[PDB]
Tab-separated table of C-alpha atoms and ligand atoms in Angstrom:
chain	number	residue	atom	x	y	z
A	1	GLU	CA	-17.070	73.436	-84.092
A	2	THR	CA	-15.134	73.873	-80.547
A	3	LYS	CA	-12.518	71.315	-81.108
A	4	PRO	CA	-8.570	72.672	-80.579
A	5	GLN	CA	-6.882	72.432	-84.163
A	6	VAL	CA	-3.534	70.048	-84.783
A	7	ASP	CA	-0.719	70.939	-86.572
A	8	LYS	CA	2.763	69.872	-87.329
A	9	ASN	CA	5.701	70.252	-91.094
A	10	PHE	CA	9.543	70.451	-91.125
A	11	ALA	CA	9.804	73.592	-88.949
A	12	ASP	CA	10.832	75.508	-92.531
A	13	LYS	CA	7.229	75.517	-93.407
A	14	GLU	CA	3.892	77.108	-92.176
A	15	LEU	CA	1.023	75.840	-90.643
A	16	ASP	CA	-2.188	74.725	-91.894
A	17	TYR	CA	-5.173	74.627	-89.393
A	18	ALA	CA	-7.970	74.173	-92.323
A	19	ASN	CA	-5.234	71.703	-93.847
A	20	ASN	CA	-3.765	69.279	-91.680
A	21	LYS	CA	-4.199	65.963	-93.792
A	22	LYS	CA	-2.683	67.792	-97.167
A	23	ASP	CA	0.448	65.699	-98.092
A	24	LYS	CA	3.666	66.616	-97.594
A	25	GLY	CA	5.794	65.469	-99.386
A	26	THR	CA	8.788	63.360	-99.184
A	27	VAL	CA	12.755	64.668	-99.125
A	28	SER	CA	15.933	63.739	-99.237
A	29	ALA	CA	18.450	63.104	-96.351
A	30	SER	CA	21.536	62.083	-95.449
A	31	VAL	CA	21.854	59.927	-93.298
A	32	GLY	CA	23.240	62.451	-89.583
A	33	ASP	CA	20.998	65.123	-90.733
A	34	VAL	CA	19.302	67.251	-88.375
A	35	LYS	CA	14.364	67.455	-88.970
A	36	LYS	CA	13.324	70.531	-86.763
A	37	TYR	CA	9.799	70.005	-86.656
A	38	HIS	CA	7.065	72.687	-85.478
A	39	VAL	CA	3.546	71.026	-84.028
A	40	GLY	CA	0.844	73.668	-83.291
A	41	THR	CA	-2.365	73.995	-81.676
A	42	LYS	CA	-4.717	75.913	-81.251
A	43	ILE	CA	-6.983	76.709	-78.630
A	44	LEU	CA	-10.326	77.748	-79.113
A	45	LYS	CA	-11.517	81.422	-76.603
A	46	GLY	CA	-13.919	78.980	-73.506
A	47	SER	CA	-11.998	76.210	-74.202
A	48	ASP	CA	-11.725	74.612	-70.109
A	49	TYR	CA	-9.273	71.382	-71.488
A	50	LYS	CA	-8.443	69.709	-68.476
A	51	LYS	CA	-6.611	66.595	-70.357
A	52	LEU	CA	-3.787	67.873	-73.149
A	53	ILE	CA	-1.683	65.116	-74.341
A	54	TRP	CA	0.667	64.666	-77.266
A	55	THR	CA	2.001	61.718	-78.457
A	56	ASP	CA	4.604	61.541	-82.160
A	57	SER	CA	5.721	58.188	-82.276
A	58	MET	CA	8.128	57.801	-84.549
A	59	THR	CA	10.039	55.024	-87.782
A	60	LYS	CA	12.722	53.286	-86.312
A	61	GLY	CA	15.545	55.776	-88.782
A	62	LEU	CA	14.897	58.610	-86.625
A	63	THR	CA	16.295	59.057	-83.489
A	64	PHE	CA	14.378	62.054	-81.209
A	65	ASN	CA	16.903	64.533	-80.193
A	66	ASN	CA	15.084	65.069	-77.006
A	67	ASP	CA	14.996	68.939	-77.382
A	68	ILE	CA	11.199	70.240	-77.552
A	69	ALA	CA	10.022	73.692	-75.714
A	70	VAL	CA	6.331	74.534	-75.701
A	71	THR	CA	5.467	77.981	-76.007
A	72	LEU	CA	1.970	79.411	-74.777
A	73	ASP	CA	0.903	82.176	-77.437
A	74	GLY	CA	4.668	83.137	-77.897
A	75	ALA	CA	6.557	83.230	-74.772
A	76	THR	CA	7.854	80.253	-73.734
A	77	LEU	CA	6.188	77.632	-71.057
A	78	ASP	CA	8.304	75.577	-68.975
A	79	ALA	CA	8.528	72.043	-66.956
A	80	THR	CA	6.542	73.135	-63.975
A	81	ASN	CA	3.458	72.471	-67.190
A	82	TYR	CA	4.142	69.340	-68.481
A	83	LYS	CA	5.067	66.235	-67.876
A	84	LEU	CA	7.469	64.668	-70.982
A	85	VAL	CA	8.110	60.782	-71.314
A	86	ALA	CA	10.875	60.000	-74.360
A	87	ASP	CA	12.180	57.957	-75.438
A	88	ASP	CA	14.193	57.329	-78.736
A	89	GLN	CA	11.996	57.153	-81.172
A	90	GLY	CA	9.533	59.063	-79.395
A	91	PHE	CA	7.551	60.972	-76.576
A	92	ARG	CA	4.004	61.187	-74.657
A	93	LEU	CA	4.304	65.059	-73.164
A	94	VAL	CA	0.635	65.640	-70.906
A	95	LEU	CA	0.222	68.943	-70.230
A	96	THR	CA	-0.158	69.405	-65.567
A	97	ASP	CA	-2.677	70.482	-64.317
A	98	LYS	CA	-0.705	74.311	-64.000
A	99	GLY	CA	-0.547	73.814	-67.060
A	100	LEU	CA	-3.841	73.609	-68.264
A	101	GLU	CA	-5.056	75.668	-66.118
A	102	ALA	CA	-2.985	78.464	-67.555
A	103	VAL	CA	-3.884	77.289	-70.732
A	104	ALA	CA	-7.247	77.851	-69.159
A	105	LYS	CA	-6.291	81.047	-68.196
A	106	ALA	CA	-5.315	82.589	-71.161
A	107	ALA	CA	-8.295	81.193	-73.945
A	108	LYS	CA	-10.781	82.791	-71.544
A	109	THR	CA	-10.434	86.111	-73.036
A	110	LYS	CA	-9.054	84.512	-76.895
A	111	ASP	CA	-7.714	81.492	-78.782
A	112	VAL	CA	-4.288	80.804	-77.631
A	113	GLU	CA	-1.671	78.692	-79.472
A	114	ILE	CA	0.337	76.399	-78.396
A	115	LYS	CA	4.135	75.628	-79.812
A	116	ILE	CA	6.215	72.213	-79.468
A	117	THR	CA	9.219	72.151	-81.009
A	118	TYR	CA	12.732	69.972	-81.210
A	119	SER	CA	14.209	67.226	-84.071
A	120	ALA	CA	14.574	64.041	-85.433
A	121	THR	CA	18.185	62.651	-86.203
A	122	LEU	CA	18.759	60.599	-89.388
A	123	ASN	CA	19.861	57.855	-88.099
A	124	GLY	CA	22.029	54.450	-90.105
A	125	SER	CA	18.904	52.103	-89.385
A	126	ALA	CA	17.070	54.323	-92.361
A	127	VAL	CA	16.898	51.864	-95.419
A	128	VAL	CA	17.758	53.082	-98.563
A	129	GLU	CA	14.722	54.443	-100.439
A	130	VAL	CA	12.232	53.461	-97.156
A	131	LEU	CA	10.163	56.259	-96.191
A	132	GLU	CA	10.605	57.562	-92.351
A	133	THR	CA	8.339	59.381	-90.062
A	134	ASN	CA	6.892	60.703	-87.268
A	135	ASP	CA	3.487	61.253	-86.588
A	136	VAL	CA	2.063	63.366	-83.197
A	137	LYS	CA	-1.677	62.680	-81.864
A	138	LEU	CA	-3.186	64.775	-79.537
A	139	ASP	CA	-5.283	63.829	-76.897
A	140	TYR	CA	-7.510	66.574	-74.953
A	141	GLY	CA	-10.852	66.317	-73.260
A	142	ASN	CA	-12.898	68.247	-70.415
A	143	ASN	CA	-12.703	65.291	-67.526
A	144	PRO	CA	-8.601	64.881	-65.023
A	145	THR	CA	-7.638	61.904	-66.053
A	146	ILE	CA	-4.702	60.538	-63.954
A	147	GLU	CA	-1.488	59.623	-65.797
A	148	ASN	CA	-0.429	56.082	-65.038
A	149	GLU	CA	4.105	55.519	-64.908
A	150	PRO	CA	5.782	53.494	-66.956
A	151	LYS	CA	7.024	49.905	-64.682
A	152	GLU	CA	10.765	48.498	-64.678
A	153	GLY	CA	11.802	45.870	-63.926
A	154	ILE	CA	14.652	42.654	-65.237
A	155	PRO	CA	13.891	40.076	-67.153
A	156	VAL	CA	13.074	36.045	-66.867
A	157	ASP	CA	14.923	33.710	-68.645
A	158	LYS	CA	15.638	36.478	-71.257
A	159	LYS	CA	12.277	37.329	-72.551
A	160	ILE	CA	10.480	39.933	-71.268
A	161	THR	CA	6.417	39.232	-72.150
A	162	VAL	CA	3.721	41.806	-72.775
A	163	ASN	CA	0.242	41.322	-71.942
A	164	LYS	CA	-1.985	43.857	-73.356
A	165	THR	CA	-5.949	44.352	-72.552
A	166	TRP	CA	-8.535	46.473	-74.128
A	167	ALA	CA	-11.305	48.082	-72.074
A	168	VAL	CA	-14.151	51.707	-72.866
A	169	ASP	CA	-15.597	52.908	-69.404
A	170	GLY	CA	-13.968	49.781	-67.838
A	171	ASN	CA	-16.328	46.729	-70.513
A	172	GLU	CA	-13.328	44.692	-72.377
A	173	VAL	CA	-12.450	44.738	-75.581
A	174	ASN	CA	-11.754	42.008	-77.813
A	175	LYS	CA	-11.964	43.719	-81.992
A	176	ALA	CA	-9.969	42.543	-85.098
A	177	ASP	CA	-12.140	45.147	-87.018
A	178	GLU	CA	-10.870	48.121	-83.948
A	179	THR	CA	-7.666	49.770	-85.681
A	180	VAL	CA	-5.306	50.851	-82.880
A	181	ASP	CA	-1.389	52.909	-82.789
A	182	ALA	CA	0.309	51.259	-79.331
A	183	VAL	CA	3.780	50.567	-79.471
A	184	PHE	CA	5.971	49.014	-77.406
A	185	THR	CA	8.767	50.483	-76.514
A	186	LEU	CA	11.490	48.866	-74.158
A	187	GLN	CA	14.220	50.317	-73.451
A	188	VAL	CA	17.406	48.454	-71.197
A	189	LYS	CA	18.887	51.038	-68.875
A	190	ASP	CA	22.163	51.721	-70.023
A	191	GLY	CA	24.543	53.742	-67.590
A	192	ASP	CA	22.169	56.798	-66.207
A	193	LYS	CA	20.800	56.194	-70.011
A	194	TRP	CA	18.117	54.751	-70.878
A	195	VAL	CA	18.088	53.413	-74.526
A	196	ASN	CA	15.609	51.867	-76.921
A	197	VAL	CA	16.164	48.157	-77.914
A	198	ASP	CA	12.779	46.669	-79.447
A	199	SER	CA	9.752	47.553	-79.792
A	200	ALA	CA	6.554	45.987	-81.595
A	201	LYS	CA	3.144	47.544	-82.241
A	202	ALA	CA	-0.994	46.423	-81.613
A	203	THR	CA	-2.279	46.797	-84.605
A	204	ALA	CA	-5.713	46.072	-82.903
A	205	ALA	CA	-8.253	46.503	-80.666
A	206	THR	CA	-7.964	42.702	-78.919
A	207	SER	CA	-6.477	40.827	-75.743
A	208	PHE	CA	-2.064	41.239	-77.132
A	209	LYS	CA	0.206	39.624	-75.775
A	210	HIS	CA	4.446	40.188	-77.190
A	211	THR	CA	7.891	38.299	-76.167
A	212	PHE	CA	10.653	39.999	-76.044
A	213	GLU	CA	13.658	37.666	-76.541
A	214	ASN	CA	17.466	37.887	-75.839
A	215	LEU	CA	17.559	40.341	-73.419
A	216	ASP	CA	20.408	40.227	-70.289
A	217	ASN	CA	18.925	38.690	-67.376
A	218	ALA	CA	21.301	40.529	-65.099
A	219	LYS	CA	20.507	44.358	-66.839
A	220	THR	CA	17.136	45.843	-65.632
A	221	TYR	CA	14.446	47.378	-68.624
A	222	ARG	CA	11.450	49.278	-68.685
A	223	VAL	CA	8.670	49.282	-71.645
A	224	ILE	CA	6.656	52.154	-71.949
A	225	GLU	CA	3.558	52.128	-74.766
A	226	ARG	CA	2.310	54.839	-76.990
A	227	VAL	CA	-0.909	55.499	-77.755
A	228	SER	CA	-3.618	57.828	-78.672
A	229	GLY	CA	-6.855	57.048	-78.099
A	230	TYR	CA	-6.287	54.906	-75.161
A	231	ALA	CA	-3.642	55.661	-72.762
A	232	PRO	CA	-1.987	52.820	-70.610
A	233	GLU	CA	-2.304	52.044	-67.157
A	234	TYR	CA	0.903	50.303	-66.096
A	235	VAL	CA	-0.866	47.118	-64.033
A	236	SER	CA	2.407	45.293	-63.362
A	237	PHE	CA	5.986	44.134	-63.402
A	238	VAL	CA	6.022	40.816	-61.817
A	239	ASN	CA	7.998	37.068	-63.348
A	240	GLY	CA	8.795	38.821	-66.165
A	241	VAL	CA	5.712	40.005	-67.407
A	242	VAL	CA	4.449	43.296	-68.075
A	243	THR	CA	1.093	43.761	-67.859
A	244	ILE	CA	-0.640	46.544	-69.262
A	245	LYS	CA	-4.708	47.467	-70.399
A	246	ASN	CA	-5.328	50.098	-72.051
A	247	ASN	CA	-8.728	52.384	-71.033
A	248	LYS	CA	-10.822	54.430	-73.284
A	249	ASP	CA	-13.636	57.077	-71.981
A	250	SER	CA	-16.648	56.105	-74.508
A	251	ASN	CA	-17.256	60.766	-74.239
A	252	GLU	CA	-14.508	61.532	-74.652
A	253	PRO	CA	-12.572	63.110	-78.053
A	254	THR	CA	-11.655	61.235	-81.332
A	255	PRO	CA	-7.941	62.245	-80.216
A	256	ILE	CA	-6.854	64.757	-83.681
A	257	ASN	CA	-4.070	64.130	-85.760
A	258	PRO	CA	-2.591	65.923	-88.572
A	259	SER	CA	0.444	65.151	-92.236
A	260	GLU	CA	2.840	64.928	-91.848
A	261	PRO	CA	5.955	65.193	-93.701
A	262	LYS	CA	8.176	62.336	-95.334
A	263	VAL	CA	11.944	61.389	-94.742
A	264	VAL	CA	13.878	59.661	-96.907
A	265	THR	CA	17.900	58.468	-97.767
A	266	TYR	CA	19.262	56.984	-101.421
A	267	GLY	CA	22.150	55.364	-102.753
A	268	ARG	CA	23.735	53.435	-105.348
A	269	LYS	CA	25.356	50.093	-105.529
A	270	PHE	CA	28.868	49.328	-108.155
A	271	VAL	CA	30.519	46.603	-109.782
A	272	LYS	CA	34.336	46.695	-110.547
A	273	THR	CA	35.105	45.012	-113.264
A	274	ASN	CA	38.449	44.537	-115.422
A	275	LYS	CA	38.091	46.022	-119.022
A	276	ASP	CA	35.512	43.635	-120.336
A	277	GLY	CA	33.683	42.626	-118.138
A	278	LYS	CA	33.916	38.774	-117.935
A	279	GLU	CA	36.118	39.445	-114.422
A	280	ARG	CA	34.446	41.125	-111.442
A	281	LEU	CA	37.665	42.155	-108.746
A	282	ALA	CA	37.239	41.780	-105.299
A	283	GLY	CA	39.848	43.858	-102.865
A	284	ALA	CA	39.676	47.785	-105.082
A	285	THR	CA	39.290	50.044	-101.953
A	286	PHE	CA	37.290	53.604	-102.651
A	287	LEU	CA	37.062	56.736	-100.439
A	288	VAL	CA	33.758	58.412	-100.780
A	289	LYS	CA	33.979	62.002	-101.294
A	290	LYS	CA	31.087	65.570	-101.689
A	291	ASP	CA	33.290	68.668	-102.582
A	292	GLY	CA	36.277	67.828	-101.359
A	293	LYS	CA	35.423	66.326	-99.030
A	294	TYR	CA	35.354	62.755	-97.676
A	295	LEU	CA	32.341	60.381	-95.846
A	296	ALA	CA	33.430	58.725	-92.831
A	297	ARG	CA	31.342	57.798	-89.421
A	298	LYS	CA	30.584	58.417	-85.836
A	299	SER	CA	27.593	56.736	-83.105
A	300	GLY	CA	24.649	57.542	-82.609
A	301	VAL	CA	22.218	57.329	-80.083
A	302	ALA	CA	22.924	53.503	-78.722
A	303	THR	CA	23.738	51.067	-75.761
A	304	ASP	CA	28.198	51.020	-75.039
A	305	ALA	CA	28.532	47.708	-76.211
A	306	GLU	CA	26.287	48.370	-79.841
A	307	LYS	CA	29.803	51.605	-79.928
A	308	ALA	CA	32.464	49.286	-78.643
A	309	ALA	CA	31.945	46.311	-80.738
A	310	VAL	CA	31.812	49.241	-83.814
A	311	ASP	CA	35.947	49.553	-82.604
A	312	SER	CA	36.664	46.163	-81.945
A	313	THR	CA	34.794	44.760	-85.926
A	314	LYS	CA	37.153	47.776	-86.825
A	315	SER	CA	40.483	46.116	-85.344
A	316	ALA	CA	39.338	42.756	-87.121
A	317	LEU	CA	38.877	44.332	-89.742
A	318	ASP	CA	42.201	46.836	-89.816
A	319	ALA	CA	43.784	42.973	-89.009
A	320	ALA	CA	42.483	41.583	-92.144
A	321	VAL	CA	43.534	44.049	-94.155
A	322	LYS	CA	47.231	44.039	-93.025
A	323	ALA	CA	47.266	40.585	-93.437
A	324	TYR	CA	46.098	40.358	-96.887
A	325	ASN	CA	48.432	43.562	-97.333
A	326	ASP	CA	51.507	42.131	-96.199
A	327	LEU	CA	51.588	38.919	-98.073
A	328	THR	CA	53.699	38.498	-102.190
A	329	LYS	CA	52.504	39.602	-105.086
A	330	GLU	CA	52.316	36.574	-105.643
A	331	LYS	CA	50.777	35.066	-103.254
A	332	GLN	CA	47.893	37.713	-103.825
A	333	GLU	CA	47.566	37.225	-107.155
A	334	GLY	CA	46.595	32.815	-105.801
A	335	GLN	CA	44.712	31.812	-103.421
A	336	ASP	CA	46.341	33.008	-100.543
A	337	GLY	CA	45.190	36.487	-102.059
A	338	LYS	CA	41.934	35.460	-102.593
A	339	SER	CA	40.619	33.879	-99.437
A	340	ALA	CA	42.473	36.473	-97.512
A	341	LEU	CA	40.179	38.845	-99.693
A	342	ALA	CA	37.039	37.264	-98.245
A	343	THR	CA	38.537	37.615	-95.250
A	344	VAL	CA	38.539	41.038	-95.017
A	345	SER	CA	34.892	41.386	-96.687
A	346	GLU	CA	33.766	39.568	-94.382
A	347	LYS	CA	35.537	41.631	-91.709
A	348	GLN	CA	33.681	45.000	-93.284
A	349	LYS	CA	30.543	43.805	-93.542
A	350	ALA	CA	30.592	42.686	-90.308
A	351	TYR	CA	32.362	46.568	-89.208
A	352	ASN	CA	29.738	47.955	-91.838
A	353	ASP	CA	27.313	45.889	-89.425
A	354	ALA	CA	27.782	47.888	-85.927
A	355	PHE	CA	27.703	50.888	-86.939
A	356	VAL	CA	24.702	50.444	-88.448
A	357	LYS	CA	23.704	48.661	-84.735
A	358	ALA	CA	24.785	51.698	-83.867
A	359	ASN	CA	22.707	54.403	-85.305
A	360	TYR	CA	25.642	55.905	-87.163
A	361	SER	CA	25.414	59.579	-88.190
A	362	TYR	CA	27.700	60.444	-90.959
A	363	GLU	CA	29.657	64.000	-91.535
A	364	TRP	CA	31.932	64.850	-93.624
A	365	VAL	CA	35.587	65.230	-93.221
A	366	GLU	CA	38.330	67.080	-95.347
A	367	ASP	CA	40.868	64.378	-93.965
A	368	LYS	CA	41.321	61.253	-95.793
A	369	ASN	CA	43.051	59.912	-93.492
A	370	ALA	CA	40.330	60.340	-90.310
A	371	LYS	CA	40.345	57.265	-88.205
A	372	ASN	CA	36.453	56.688	-89.039
A	373	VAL	CA	36.784	57.576	-93.341
A	374	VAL	CA	33.924	55.994	-94.755
A	375	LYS	CA	35.249	52.813	-97.149
A	376	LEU	CA	34.136	50.602	-98.975
A	377	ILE	CA	36.151	46.998	-100.150
A	378	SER	CA	34.448	45.362	-103.770
A	379	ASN	CA	34.477	41.628	-102.500
A	380	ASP	CA	34.999	38.317	-104.724
A	381	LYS	CA	31.910	39.319	-106.980
A	382	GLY	CA	33.319	43.306	-107.627
A	383	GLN	CA	30.510	44.511	-105.315
A	384	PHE	CA	30.423	48.320	-103.605
A	385	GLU	CA	27.675	50.251	-102.440
A	386	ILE	CA	26.715	52.959	-100.225
A	387	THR	CA	23.721	53.357	-98.835
A	388	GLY	CA	22.005	57.375	-96.373
A	389	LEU	CA	23.025	59.936	-99.338
A	390	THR	CA	21.008	62.632	-99.533
A	391	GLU	CA	20.009	63.000	-104.064
A	392	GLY	CA	23.527	64.611	-105.308
A	393	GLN	CA	26.934	64.162	-107.783
A	394	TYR	CA	29.457	62.787	-105.489
A	395	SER	CA	32.554	60.422	-106.497
A	396	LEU	CA	34.940	57.554	-105.375
A	397	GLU	CA	38.344	58.611	-104.704
A	398	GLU	CA	40.487	55.524	-105.153
A	399	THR	CA	43.084	54.251	-102.181
A	400	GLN	CA	43.675	50.693	-103.572
A	401	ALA	CA	44.167	48.855	-106.777
A	402	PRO	CA	42.845	45.228	-106.660
A	403	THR	CA	45.653	43.446	-107.274
A	404	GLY	CA	47.493	43.546	-111.207
A	405	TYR	CA	45.357	46.089	-111.516
A	406	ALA	CA	46.813	49.850	-112.918
A	407	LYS	CA	44.621	52.626	-110.056
A	408	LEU	CA	42.666	54.410	-112.035
A	409	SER	CA	43.315	57.316	-113.865
A	410	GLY	CA	40.821	60.266	-111.126
A	411	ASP	CA	37.548	60.176	-109.206
A	412	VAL	CA	34.684	57.967	-110.610
A	413	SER	CA	32.036	60.926	-110.751
A	414	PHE	CA	27.892	58.546	-109.567
A	415	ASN	CA	24.797	60.288	-108.849
A	416	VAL	CA	22.755	59.286	-106.213
A	417	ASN	CA	18.455	59.988	-106.806
A	418	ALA	CA	15.557	58.831	-106.311
A	419	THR	CA	16.408	55.261	-108.040
A	420	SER	CA	19.210	55.224	-107.633
A	421	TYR	CA	19.717	51.923	-105.866
A	422	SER	CA	16.474	50.211	-106.757
A	423	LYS	CA	16.451	50.453	-110.358
A	424	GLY	CA	19.914	52.949	-111.113
A	425	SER	CA	21.228	54.452	-114.286
A	426	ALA	CA	21.276	53.868	-117.813
A	427	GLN	CA	24.701	52.160	-118.269
A	428	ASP	CA	24.031	50.087	-115.405
A	429	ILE	CA	24.916	46.071	-115.291
A	430	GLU	CA	23.710	43.839	-112.867
A	431	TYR	CA	24.259	43.860	-108.711
A	432	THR	CA	23.919	40.181	-108.805
A	433	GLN	CA	24.922	38.232	-112.273
A	434	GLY	CA	22.558	35.762	-114.249
A	435	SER	CA	19.470	38.200	-112.247
A	436	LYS	CA	18.214	40.469	-115.248
A	437	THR	CA	18.544	43.631	-112.581
A	438	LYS	CA	20.731	46.328	-114.822
A	439	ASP	CA	22.219	48.322	-110.755
A	440	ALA	CA	24.729	48.361	-110.713
A	441	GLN	CA	27.665	51.218	-111.980
A	442	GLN	CA	30.276	49.162	-113.437
A	443	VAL	CA	34.329	50.511	-112.218
A	444	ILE	CA	36.440	49.485	-115.377
A	445	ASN	CA	39.870	48.324	-114.700
A	446	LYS	CA	43.427	47.857	-116.314
A	447	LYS	CA	45.469	45.385	-116.808
A	448	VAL	CA	49.650	46.931	-114.912
A	449	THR	CA	51.022	47.301	-118.375
B	1	LIG	K1	-0.357	62.233	-87.210
B	2	LIG	K1	19.302	50.258	-114.987
């Protein structure tokens, strides 16, 4: 029992080295919320490790905030003590010779604690009711090990292909029953920044290939591997192929792998209908409100192009909305209104899609006329919805009634909880007619008198 002890949790939850794989629960959050983490590593007296490597691999809905700070027995350990390879969904932190010696020197008289703190942002790629999580592991051992650097390159015919093999003690391994945790992240150079654009996982120690498609031949990319047990050797990047060999020494220890807390976000579906419920209504427009403030969106970590698509899709939506609003009432009540609203709902979908691709964050604003405020618009089946909200009570504030129907007499309260999106509430109706799944809150409209 000379092994390092490692635990990870949210910063506000105490570490427990003796119970480091306990259930750490699921917490509710809103998209845009920041979760703070700490990872502790206890190195026992007399340890002389020549390799200490922490890898955290996060799910797609968590953006790693690249804000690592490291301490050794409480005192700051600066960046001369480690080498960090960060991407938008995690990192690999490797102690340098200097860092390793500092740890060994400290440990010769007592147990020492390394603490690594950082945060992630819950982003707009999160899927309602589907758990998000980080995952840290510590690779360690007594032998100096060369750290190979990821290679950059370009696509060929809009493709980059990873060619992967596995070896133990220099002997190739092809074992479909041996689980591994390798993640291959494709990043693009965007200005002075590396931005994650795609990813692929290998789940067994088998010869493996994956082809990233739809790439830009004029742009520069890199593939970064996050993996434990094995370590990557970036052999070559030529002719649109990245060749990687994973190496492991059989005499080295298994990585330490603590459990992690989970993060989740929730939603609600609605259907706008007339009084008797037999007609579902398009064009009903709503703000989303929490404590008198209004839901709004901003881009997260994304490429310039992804952020620019938010603005161009918004312009198209605005134009479609104006085209409908400028129609006469008789045209709005007829075929030209229905087709115009169909176009609005198409542009609304594209705008929402662009914000999701830009990894959006929510914010709450006091001004309901802010350019970036969320407006939900009922489609031809009366449908609209909201996702990415922490559990609690909210309201819809109507900004436009469907043509020929009266303005609602007040705000429409709704509740978000662990199954509000998938199962809904007692008095719900069907989001899609004839589904036999009553999962949408009915919002009743009355005709103008
Ligand atoms: K873990
Ligand atoms: K229900």
